[PDB]
Amino acid sequence: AFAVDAAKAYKDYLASGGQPITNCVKMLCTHTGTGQAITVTPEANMDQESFGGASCCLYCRCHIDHPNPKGFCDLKGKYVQIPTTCANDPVGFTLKNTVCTVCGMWKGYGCSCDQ
């Protein structure tokens, strides 16, 4: 059967040099939060920006179905913390990266479980 692959489409679009999705909603916050990846309120630390989740979700922003079988969205209604160095492309970041199921941090951007 045939399902469009949007994740791959955006990744190849980025590699080919296309400009990242814009108008992700960045929040004002203290930048003294827990640094966890996805939270119910902005939790950015000194090295993160906080964004509204829906605006950083590729499926939300492109009006396409979510790859969850039930269509549920990880990010919508929450806040996603993006390393300030990757905050030019929050959608690409969230798509390409993974939250540690134990400590709640981004794998490779805060998760120290593996040390």
Binding site: M27, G53, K76, A87
Partner: protein
């Protein structure tokens, strides 16, 4: 003076007591823009200052609070204001938003369409509106009370705002309605609030604090809007972003304000006192059900 470190400026009471005539709004800093923090959208900064101001009032904040946000879509397809509202509101607060065109939101439910198609079974503790038609700032015709979405909003307040609840409704020099001002007299307190980030605009938010369901004071809304313009015309507000850099006390204190279902016979002076203090919400505490009316047409042959 110190107004620059506030989230904004509220209409001083003495201006509300005047009997001015409607003039054109002439803001000396018109066209200026405040310096927003790096990467921060205007509508994020504006709603943040609004909520910062709201934290200084006596809002009822019950458990299972219910908030509805009209005019929530931007021209970008996202809902910056809804995101600030959800950050501000206690976690778990039921948040519904709506706008004419399609948009992506962090709200628990979003209704797309004219606001007049929106119906809800239940009552609300807080109503936010940023509804605005920019075609209204037409400076060559007379500036009369506007109807449109404002007629809907006055009806929605009377019918679906819980007693003790609060509202904030964007207006401008030209986007305003006299009955809405009149309604402000149905609250324990009211003001027009100008965010410091947008002080160069005739925009303000009409805030009614703690709804009482009946006129507490009688307001002529043509006169009050003229009072509001007179204030803006004679009180330059210095653009400022300063309050955006301090967010430590931003979240709305969950006060666990009490909810009681009550009948009109039972609203006495003690109750009304409590309503007036942000200490009581009166409404059903049922489940929250909303709908958007859909017009059906077949355009074939």
């Amino acid at each position: 003076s110190s107004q620059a470190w506030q989230p904004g400026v509220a209409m001083p009471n003495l201006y509300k007591m005047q009997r001015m005539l409607l003039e054109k709004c002439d803001l000396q800093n018109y066209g200026d823009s405040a310096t927003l923090p790096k990467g921060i959208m205007m509508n994020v900064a504006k709603y943040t200052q609004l909520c910062q101001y709201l934290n200084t009032l006596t809002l009822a904040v019950p458990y299972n609070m219910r908030v509805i946000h009209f005019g929530a879509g931007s021209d970008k397809g996202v809902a910056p204001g809804t995101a600030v509202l959800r950050q501000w509101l206690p976690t778990g607060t039921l948040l519904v938003d709506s706008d004419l065109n399609d948009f992506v939101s962090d709200a628990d439910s979003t209704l797309i369409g004219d606001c007049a198609t929106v119906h809800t079974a239940n009552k609300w503790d807080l109503i936010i509106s940023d509804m605005y038609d920019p075609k209204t700032k037409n400076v060559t015709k007379e500036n009369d009370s506007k109807e449109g979405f404002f007629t809907y909003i006055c009806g929605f307040i009377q019918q679906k705002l819980a007693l003790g609840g609060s509202v904030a409704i964007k207006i401008t020099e030209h986007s305003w309605n006299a009955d809405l001002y009149k309604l402000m007299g149905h609250f324990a307190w009211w003001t027009a609030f100008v965010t410091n980030v947008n002080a160069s605009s005739s925009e303000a938010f009409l805030i009614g604090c703690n709804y009482l369901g009946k006129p507490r004071e009688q307001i002529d809304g043509y006169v009050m809007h003229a009072n509001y313009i007179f204030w803006r015309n004679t009180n330059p507000i210095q653009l400022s972003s300063y309050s955006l850099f301090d967010m430590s006390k931003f979240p709305l204190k969950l006060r666990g304000t009490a909810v009681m279902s009550l009948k009109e016979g039972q609203i006495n002076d003690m109750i009304l006192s409590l309503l007036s203090k942000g200490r009581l919400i009166i409404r059903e505490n049922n489940r929250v059900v909303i709908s958007s009316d859909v017009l059906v047409n077949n355009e074939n042959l």
